[PDB]
């Protein structure tokens, strides 16, 4: 079929449980991409439908701060996802390496993340799984764009309609409404943006505990600090945006649109 004949495979960039990703060239254009090659023979019916939902949802998104899915091909014993080639690794790795971001860099970073989330929301997509591991740097270059990835847990929403879409995501980044088993939607991503922004500024999260029961109590109670000394030098408008994202009532939580107008971002 059309993958082997339209795309030329080059070296392995990474691997997962049931996938290998290789650099490839669309021979006609000579443009390079990342080909995620999935052995569908080793996938359950459930994983197979997850994959085809992920492919559908990601294809809705066309934004410089989202890892673009250009093509989806279902051949003999394989599924090929053709993505933007990204060579800068995870935002998680960059934060670890640099300890934390200056307010300038943190503001620049979360602005890009909010633009990606806003685009998702305008396309009727809620990610549900925002975290530093799911944000990739386009390159190792100085001012490389942050790109949102992994729509494996993303859902399609009907305008502003909320519903119970199930208990799904990463414990440390789960919104209070999901933990409360409340109907939810777009606001869940803005909670995760708050957790990410907090991490960018001091290099550690607002909610953590070895005991998951106690972690979920902290999140539901919205019990987070700005400890001294590291937060003492952090500007109050930075703390204000975090506070406006980490509100336990999603109806009172700042949206992606409103967040991008917030002084700390719009005056930077």
């Amino acid at each position: 079929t059309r993958f082997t004949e339209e795309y030329q495979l080059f070296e392995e960039l990474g691997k997962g449980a049931f996938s290998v990703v290789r650099r490839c060239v669309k021979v006609l254009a000579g443009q390079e991409y990342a080909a995620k090659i999935i052995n569908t023979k080793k996938l359950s019916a459930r994983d197979h439908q997850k994959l085809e939902r992920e492919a559908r949802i990601c294809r809705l998104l066309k934004h410089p701060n989202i890892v673009r899915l250009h093509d989806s091909i279902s051949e003999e014993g394989h599924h090929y996802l053709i993505f933007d080639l990204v060579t800068g690794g995870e935002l998680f790795e960059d934060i670890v390496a640099r300890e934390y971001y200056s307010e300038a860099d943190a503001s620049h970073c979360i602005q890009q993340i909010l633009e990606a989330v806003l685009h998702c929301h305008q396309m009727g997509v809620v990610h549900r799984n925002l975290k530093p591991e799911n944000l990739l740097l386009a390159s190792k270059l100085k001012g490389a764009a942050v790109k949102l990835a992994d729509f494996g847990l993303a859902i399609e929403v009907e305008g502003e309609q909320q519903a119970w879409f199930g208990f799904a995501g990463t414990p440390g980044y789960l919104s209070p409404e999901v933990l409360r088993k409340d109907p939810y939607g777009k606001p869940v991503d803005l909670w995760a943006c708050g957790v990410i922004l907090y991490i960018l500024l001091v290099g550690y999260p607002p909610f953590w505990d070895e005991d998951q029961h106690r972690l979920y109590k902290q999140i539901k109670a919205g019990a987070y600090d700005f400890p001294s000394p590291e937060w003492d030098t952090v500007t109050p408008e930075a703390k204000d945006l975090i506070n406006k994202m980490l509100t336990i009532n999603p109806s009172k939580r700042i949206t992606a649109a409103e967040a991008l107008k917030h002084p700390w971002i719009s005056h930077r």
Binding site: E133, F167, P171, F207
Partner: peptide, 16 residues
């Protein structure tokens, strides 16, 4: 302080 660790995605409620 709180630990910055890699965390895994769950598709359902799994009580840890």
């Amino acid at each position: 302080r709180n630990k910055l660790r890699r965390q895994h995605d769950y598709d359902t409620f799994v009580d840890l």
